[PDB]
Amino acid sequence: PPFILSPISLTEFSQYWAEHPELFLEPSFINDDNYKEHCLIDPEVESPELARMLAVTKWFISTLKSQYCSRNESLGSEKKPLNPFLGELFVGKWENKEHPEFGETVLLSEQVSHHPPVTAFSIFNDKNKVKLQGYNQIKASFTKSLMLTVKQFGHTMLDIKDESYLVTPPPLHIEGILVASPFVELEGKSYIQSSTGLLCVIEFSGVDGKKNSFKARIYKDSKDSKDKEKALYTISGQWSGSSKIIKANKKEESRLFYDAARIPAEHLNVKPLEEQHPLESRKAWYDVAGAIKLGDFNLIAKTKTELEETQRELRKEEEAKGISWQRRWFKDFDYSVTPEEGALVPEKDDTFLKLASALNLSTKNAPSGTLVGDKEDRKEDLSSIHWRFQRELWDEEKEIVL
């Protein structure tokens, strides 16, 4: 066992959707009057919608490394994920003081389900009108071989002012591939469907091809995505390393698209344990995390039972104050054709339904990226529940602060 063990609650993994402050906000600084300047990899980008789609694609790739690489040699740490308890919260903010034009970007993460485990999150920047929200859920199991496949469920939505993007995470990742390491590989297709019609398809190598490699293609619309030759741009390389982009078929003009080595200057600002509510992750798992570094499973069992008892009493107090701790900032909406009575239902102009339609994506609780008609989508009575952020609920939060 190498490196310094770092137990971290899965509720914290939500922060990796905006680890690079500048990449997260770039799309919002691109308008009709400067788009050609805001596109390093192609000073001759056809339209602003296209420059924004490239900026979004870059931002998406930048989130991958931290999500799937547990070891980090420039820090000497090995991440040990902790299964969040119901009602757990993790909040913080990127102050971006070194860039006044960016503004404060807030992160709210919450464990909305324990059985099964579901994490919901929202990252929003009021100043530039950039907001993201999504939820995550996985199902692991072994295949004929050490394999151990993890299916991804859920999706995320990005709003750049009035422009919308539907992002679906990597459908699959394989664990326990390399000897003596928690190395992980991605497989399947991820999509970035914009309200502008543009669609990006990101294909992961799986256990084949290069290590942690991908092939991204941007199409003018969903129909075009059926033929790889109609791709406006093609990006390929390592999502944990570097990649290059090629416009049309001009292989003679390949440019460096993204290099994961780049370390972000801005760090997520999280308040110290002293001023943290007992529902917040770092404070709730502190002892357990310590015991886990000690390695003593007797101390781990003890600290765990204590977290449980603490949390049990905390919930009682939360209710006593009339606080809906179980669904504090996110509510579960039913998107099925015929929902149950009391179920929260979507609105008529639901962004998710619009974009999913354009992409022809299953709106059911199937693996991420499942297309309508796929085996997974045809399954008998599959639910269609999706978690949604409610800004107002955060606006009236009386206990949690940043």
Residues 6+ apart with CB under 8 A from 273: 282, 283, 286
Whole-number Å distance between alpha carbons of 189 and 170:
6
Whole-number Å distance between alpha carbons of 264 and 266:
6
Q: What does the block give as tokens for 329?
A: 């900032």
Whole-number Å distance between alpha carbons of 138 and 126:
31
**189 contacts 171 by C-beta, under 8 angstroms:** yes
Residue 80 is labelled as binding a ligand: yes
Helix (H) or strand (E) holding 191: strand 184-194
The 3-class SS string of 223-247 reads CHHHCHHHCCEEEEEECCCEEEEEE
Residue 38 is labelled as binding a ligand: no
Whole-number Å distance between alpha carbons of 135 and 131:
14
Q: Hey, CA dihedral for 271, 276, 281, 286, is it positive or negative? A: positive
- Classify domain 273-322 by CATH number: 6.10.140.1150
Residues 6+ apart with CB under 8 A from 319: 325
Max CA-CA distance within the chain?
67
Residue in the block written with tokens 């939820």: 135
Helix, strand or coil for residue 269?
A: strand
Q: List the domain boundaries for the chain.
A: 1-272+323-401, 273-322
Q: What is the resolution of this structure in A?
A: 2.5
The experimental method behind these coordinates is X-ray
Residue 354 is labelled as binding a ligand: no
Residue 72 is labelled as binding a ligand: no
Residue 318 is labelled as binding a ligand: no
Positions of chain breaks in the chain, given as the residue before each break (C to N > 2.5 Å): none
Residue 81 is labelled as binding a ligand: yes
Residue 117 is labelled as binding a ligand: no
Half-sphere exposure at residue 125, Cβ-oriented, CA atoms within 13 angstroms: 27
Residue 79 is labelled as binding a ligand: no
Nearest to 368 by CA among 148, 168, 120: 168
Write the CA distances from 158 to 25, 27, 52, 350, integer angstroms.
Answer: 11, 10, 12, 13
Whole-number Å distance between alpha carbons of 334 and 320:
28
**122 contacts 131 by C-beta, under 8 angstroms:** yes
Q: What does the block give as tokens for 333?
A: 């909406």
